[PDB]
Amino acid sequence: LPMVGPLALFRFADGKDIVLIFMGTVMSVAHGAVLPLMCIVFGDMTDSFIKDSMTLQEDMQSFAIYYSIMGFVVLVAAYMQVSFWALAAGRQVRRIRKLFFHRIMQQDIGWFDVNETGELNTRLTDDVYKIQEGIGDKVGMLIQAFSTFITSFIIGFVKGWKLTLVILAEQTAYAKAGAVAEEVLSAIRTVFAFSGQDREIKRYHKNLEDAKNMGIKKAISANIAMGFTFLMIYLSYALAFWYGSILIMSKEYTIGTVLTVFFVVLIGAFTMGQTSPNIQSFASARGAAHKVYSIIDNQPCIDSYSDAGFKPDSIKGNIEFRNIHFNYPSRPDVKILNNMSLSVKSGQTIALVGSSGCGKSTTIQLLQRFYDPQEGSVSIDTHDIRSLNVRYLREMIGVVSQEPILFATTIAENIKYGRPDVTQQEIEQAAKEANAYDFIMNLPDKFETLVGDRGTQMSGGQKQRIAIARALVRNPKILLLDEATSALDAESETIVQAALDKVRLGRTTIVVAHRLSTIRNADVIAGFHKGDVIELGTHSQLMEKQGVYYTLVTVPPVSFLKVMRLNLSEWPYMALGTFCAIINGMMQPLFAVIFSKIIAVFAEPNQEIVRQKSEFFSLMFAAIGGVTFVTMFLQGFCFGKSGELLTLKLRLGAFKSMMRQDLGWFDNPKNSVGALTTRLATDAAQVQGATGVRMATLAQNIANLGTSIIISFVYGWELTLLILSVVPIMAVAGSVQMEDKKELEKAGKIATEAIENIRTVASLTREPKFESLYQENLHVPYKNSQKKAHVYGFTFSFSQAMIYFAYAGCFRFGAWLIKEGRMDAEGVYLVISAVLFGAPNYAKAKMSASHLMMLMNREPAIDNLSEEGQSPDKFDGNVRFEGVKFNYPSRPEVPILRGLNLKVSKGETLALVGSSGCGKSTTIQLLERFYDPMHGKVELDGISAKQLNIHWLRSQIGIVSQEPVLFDCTLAENIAYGDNSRTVTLEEIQAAAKAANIHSFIENLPQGYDTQAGDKGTQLSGGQKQRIAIARAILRNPKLLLLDEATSALDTESEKVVQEALDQASRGRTCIVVAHRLSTIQNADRIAVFQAGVVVEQGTHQQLLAKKGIYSMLVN
């Protein structure tokens, strides 16, 4: 991935930020330095106790004072470093967010066209948070770790030579499963339709089994590595003690110096180990930072903030287009506009009529400086827009289009965007100027009415009213309208038309009209054709062509209960891992006690006795390392097995529930294919990790606590109190050792509103206003984050210092213990050793598991896999609609259907067109049971569809779509997919190929039907893929064919061949076509035109033409 070094991470920093960084770096170095000095004093004290084992009160007091000063130093240094680093992160991220929004608002509309709004918002939030977390504390820990590393090596090199420290001592598996998941999920419709539930369940099962085998192998490798590291650690212990023994026999160094240097080098090596996740997090933060720094570092030639530009004042309105020629930035190949020119004098109503989609919004956008004219000149009042400043240009022109959007704020604030200089008298005068919203809502507040996302949702008419009022606030000289009359009720058209007529009194307006609302409204109307100008003329004159006007119709989490219930089957693995973990906890304190003995026994000036004791302790310690190795390996194996098996079961359950589930659930943004795949990939692993790991860690910690407690009870009541006043007071320090995010979401919401409606926010030049609102809303979360940073720094410093404070407090009791002599000098050694060696996943996994459980426990509107219902006999084909209604589930606020009485029988060829766009494939999806009908009944040979087996119905009907998705496998199985009820031989595939005029293609290539598909193999074009998809559908020979735009979005040459294949398929069986070309409809039995989401015909093509049907004018 694209990285930048550390330089492009701190580019944003002032004097104060840099000095805070330097103070934090110095204090981090202080923390690192104190880390080894503690072990230095520990070893020196070990030696002092050894000498006194055979002149200790003053030394003990000096040690106590040294530990106290070290504790205070670490407290102060840790507080300062964490707090200062967090403050630097806060300031940098505040500047980053400010500049990032500044550049978003400034970068041209093209960048948004090449960047999805939701994707850009996710990028903003995630990347900014990643930068904040990487810079602040993680970098501090990295600095501390490296400082400790260098300090440990420098002390080793300056003392205790040791002969130079003893010469210095899943994707590969889950790729197939992810590919299968992507295939079934992206192609959800095709897998569902062909009853490919069981087959794809089986393929996922097989790939999951392979993935589980690979995961077990990787667990073996990783845990063998961990056991090897433990064996190397214990060999290091044995070698260090062996060298120290030689030293004491050879009289060069002093006892304990070797122990000190050994502890220092091991702590250095393992701290170097601990930084690896931290440096990986730093690298991820740096990558996100490069992405953000790329976004900010952009200065497009189109600019709104540049004050460089002419700002005249004699504006009356004279818009000239001279040889304009533009190509879209996201597809510069297309010739959207070519050689367009047009004249618009001040105060003349000029409108344009042409083909839909092509020439309507282009002129409005270009006059708004959305995209610079590639060629040509656009002049306003004899001044070019280029020489004219963008802010001034946009301010004087009002623009309104078909998508009325109102921002998340009261009406008063929404119309405040018209201008800054609008106070109560001005706002009320402007509202009166609207002369359409003279009334008000409930809460008789006179324009002070909270209108949020849901608060008092209003109809399109009212939104157009308020939008026109906001536009009129600024009295713009030029008005641009892109079919304002659309997506509105049957009574607001007159209101909006009258309002615009009143607005037109003393102004220049260009409305681009194409729809049925009103085309003769204007005074002068011109014609556009594929961007170019046909001619400009008066409306009455334009009747001469007779081809423009008469061409129209005249969740609840769980404390790991269900996870354990699911794993209950794995007694041998869970229980064995728990027992091994319990043994490990049993052993940790025994390790402490044996180490205590081995260090203490050094007070032995003899030679043979010391030799034998050291040798025996080395042997037993090696055996202990071995038993720890075997226990760790066994527990790792067992927990890997349990985790991988749980992940397999959860993936299988999620997949099974997904297959059972309906399709409507998939269309929501949450259930996007990418998000669903990421969830299935990550959440399962997280839940696998946490459940077992929590058990193991809890068992280990409770075992350590109980073991220390019992040893303390054996040693004495004072030692019991010592354990209680060190380890379970250490409970908080070591456990809680360880939002403003939601408050941020309050501002990310206004950010999303801004970026999503970028067209509008750019139209009124309210970049600074939305910036200021963003800043005001971010002010509070910034302060909260600073306070939270202070609190976290304080708590972390206290937890860090509590270790040294407990060390010091140990003496407060050891002094009495030695003086009063209630014990022997072993309890102190034991407590110090135990506390020394004592020295997230659960939270994420609980959320992941809750997601999974809620996923495998839904109640679909219709259960796909369930078999309750009927399995009637031979189906002849008779689909009757009894006044069926439907509403789009994800967006019910846009009724897509208002009544269906479609009638088809065995052999009828009823043709649909779906040209309106409203409900193209909704009718096809209705039959496939992808969505439950809201009303009516779908009678099939005397029976409905609500109480029918979906499998049987989906079996007997052949669905063909426009996107022939082929599966990443051999053509043989790709065609065999058509019949998942039974296994198919080669003859049926031969017949399907013959009836698809495709064998001519497959006979040439030697591989033939077994030819591989994919990307590097035999790549096929649109026509070949369409014909093979038709073959796959026709394999089963269904009794009713439904095709939706089958011959659409494909090469012109292939239209004839695909149509011929379709006529071959539609032989002796009922067919429903939603094709665009009327050539296919020409040889049709009867036709039902699909207009306004309602049927408006049912009959023959000949009668359709005779009565001047819609096709006569819809020919083009």
How many other C-beta atoms lie within 10 A of the C-beta of residue 1094?
A: 15
| Architecture field, domain 319-544 | 3-Layer(aba) Sandwich (3.40)
Q: What is each CA distance from 578 to 534, 590, 639, in whole angstroms?
A: 83, 19, 9
Q: Rounded CA gap, 258 and 618, in Å?
A: 16
Q: Rounded CA gap, 100 and 352, in Å?
A: 39
Q: Rounded CA gap, 527 and 512, in Å?
A: 10
938, 945 contact by CB (below 8 A)? yes
If we measure between CA atoms, which residue out of 397, 396, 376 comes closest to residue 386? Answer: 376
| Amino acid at residue number 972 | A
DSSP string for 497-550: HHHHHHHTTTSEEEEE--SSS-SS-SSEEEEEETTEEEEEEETTGGGGT-SSST
Q: Rounded CA gap, 966 and 1028, in Å?
A: 8
Q: Rounded CA gap, 371 and 700, in Å?
A: 65
Write down the experimental method used for this entry.
Answer: cryo-EM
Element spanning 362, H or E:
helix 361-367
939, 897 contact by CB (below 8 A)? no
1022, 957 contact by CB (below 8 A)? no
CATH of 879-1114 given 3.40.50.10420, 3.30.1390.10, 3.30.70.260, 3.40.50.300: 3.40.50.300
Tally of helices (H runs) and strands (E runs) in the chain: 38, 20
**DSSP class of residue 878?**
-
Q: Rounded CA gap, 796 and 75, in Å?
A: 9
Torsion of CA 1076, 1082, 1083, 1086, to 10 degrees: 80
Q: What is each CA distance from 186 to 179, 182, 183, in whole angstroms?
A: 10, 6, 6
Six token digits for residue 325: 């020629």
Residues in the chain: 1116
Element spanning 248, H or E:
helix 197-250
Q: How many CA atoms lie within 13 A of 960 on its CB side?
A: 31
Instruction: Give the 3-state secondary structure of residue 376.
Output: strand
DSSP string for 954-972: HHHEEEE-SS-PPPSS-HH
Element spanning 378, H or E:
strand 375-380
Residues in a beta bridge with 478: 397, 508
470, 415 contact by CB (below 8 A)? yes
If we measure between CA atoms, which residue out of 964, 956, 979, 958 comes closest to residue 1042? Answer: 958
620 φ, ψ (degrees, to nearest 5): -65, -35
Tokens 């380890």 belong to residue = 727
Residue spans per domain, the chain: 319-544, 879-1114
897, 920 contact by CB (below 8 A)? no
416, 422 contact by CB (below 8 A)? yes
**DSSP class of residue 320?**
E
How many other C-beta atoms lie within 10 A of the C-beta of residue 601?
A: 15
If we measure between CA atoms, which residue out of 177, 127, 204 comes closest to residue 681? Answer: 177
Resolution in angstrom units? 3.8
Element spanning 342, H or E:
strand 340-344
476, 396 contact by CB (below 8 A)? yes
92, 354 contact by CB (below 8 A)? no
If we measure between CA atoms, which residue out of 143, 121, 122 comes closest to residue 134? Answer: 143
Residues in a beta bridge with 343: 320
Strands (E), 899-971: 903-904, 909-911, 938-940, 957-960
Q: Rounded CA gap, 654 and 648, in Å?
A: 10
700, 591 contact by CB (below 8 A)? no
**DSSP class of residue 728?**
T
**DSSP class of residue 941?**
T
337, 362 contact by CB (below 8 A)? yes
344 φ, ψ (degrees, to nearest 5): -140, 100
Residues in a beta bridge with 375: 325
| Amino acid at residue number 476 | P
Q: Rounded CA gap, 1081 and 1074, in Å?
A: 9
**Dihedral class, residue 997 (left if φ above 0, else alpha if ψ from -120 to 50, else beta):** left
Fold match flag (319-544 vs 879-1114) = yes
Q: Rounded CA gap, 590 and 693, in Å?
A: 23
Q: How many CA atoms lie within 13 A of 161 on its CB side?
A: 4
Six token digits for residue 1087: 């036709």
**DSSP class of residue 1068?**
S
| Amino acid at residue number 356 | S
Element spanning 393, H or E:
helix 390-396
862 φ, ψ (degrees, to nearest 5): -145, 130
620, 280 contact by CB (below 8 A)? no
